[PDB]
DNA sequence: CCAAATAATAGTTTTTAGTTTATTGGG
C-alpha cells in the first residue's frame, strides 16, 4: 500500500476507486506505524493538488472520518566552554506524532 | 574527537624620560 499510494497523480487520474480503500487502510495503520501515515498524507496532498476536487467529492466524506485518529489526546554551566556540546552536531532526525 | 586538573600572560595604575612651548639679542 505504501508503494500504491506512492504512485504519482498522473497514473491515478483514473479509477480513484482502486486507491481509496488502500488510502483508508494506510490512514488506519498510521495510528501504529507513523511513516506509512506520513507518506500517505503526502500522497493525499498531491492528489488534492493535482486532481480536480470534483472527482474527489464522492469520498471526501470517506477519507476525512478516518482522519479522526491522530487527534485524540494531548556541562551546561555559565562557564565559557565554547559549548562544544553545541559544536558537536545536530542529531539525525526521526519522525513523531506531533509533526 | 572533549576527557579534568593545573601555571602561565596579560586585562589595571601606577614613575619616569623625549617631548613641545615664549623670552633671549645677532645685518
Curated annotation (Swiss-Prot):
The modification Phosphoserine is found at residue 90. Autophosphorylated at two clusters, the T2609 cluster and the S2056 cluster. Autophosphorylation induces a conformational change that leads to remodeling of the DNA-PK complex, requisite for efficient end processing and DNA repair. The chain holds residues 730 to 850 of 4128 of the full protein. The gene is PRKDC. It is found in: Nucleus; Nucleus, Nucleolus; Cytoplasm, Cytosol. The lineage of its organism: Eukaryota, Metazoa, Chordata, Craniata, Vertebrata. DNA-PK is a heterotrimer of PRKDC and the Ku dimer (composed of XRCC6/Ku70 and XRCC5/Ku86). Formation of this complex may be promoted by interaction with ILF3. Component of the core long-range non-homologous end joining (NHEJ) complex (also named DNA-PK complex) composed of PRKDC, LIG4, XRCC4, XRCC6/Ku70, XRCC5/Ku86 and NHEJ1/XLF. Additional component of the NHEJ complex includes PAXX. Following autophosphorylation, PRKDC dissociates from DNA. Interacts with DNA-PKcs-interacting protein (KIP) with the region upstream the kinase domain. It comes from Homo sapiens (Human). The modification N6-acetyllysine is found at residue 77. Serine/threonine-protein kinase that acts as a molecular sensor for DNA damage. Involved in DNA non-homologous end joining (NHEJ) required for double-strand break (DSB) repair and V(D)J recombination. Must be bound to DNA to express its catalytic properties. Promotes processing of hairpin DNA structures in V(D)J recombination by activation of the hairpin endonuclease artemis (DCLRE1C). Recruited by XRCC5 and XRCC6 to DNA ends and is required to (1) protect and align broken ends of DNA, thereby preventing their degradation, (2) and sequester the DSB for repair by NHEJ. This is DNA-dependent protein kinase catalytic subunit. Disulfide bonds: none annotated. Belongs to the PI3/PI4-kinase family. It is linked to Immunodeficiency 26 with or without neurologic abnormalities: A form of severe combined immunodeficiency characterized by reduced or absent T and B cells, recurrent candidiasis, and lower respiratory tract infections. Some patients show dysmorphic features, severe growth failure, microcephaly, seizures, and impaired neurological functions.
Amino acid at each position: 500500500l505504501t508503494f500504491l499510494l506512492s504512485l504519482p497523480h498522473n497514473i491515478i487520474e483514473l479509477d480513484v476507486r482502486a486507491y481509496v480503500p488502500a488510502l483508508q487502510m494506510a490512514f488506519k495503520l498510521g495510528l501504529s506505524y507513523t511513516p506509512l501515515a506520513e507518506v500517505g498524507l503526502n500522497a493525499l496532498e498531491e492528489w488534492s493538488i493535482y486532481i480536480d476536487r470534483h472527482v474527489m467529492q464522492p469520498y471526501y466524506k470517506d477519507i476525512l472520518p478516518c482522519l479522526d485518529g491522530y487527534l485524540k489526546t494531548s556541562f551546561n554551566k555559565v562557564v565559557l566552554k565554547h559549548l562544544k556540546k553545541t559544536k558537536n552536531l545536530s542529531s539525525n532526525e526521526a519522525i513523531s506524532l506531533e509533526e
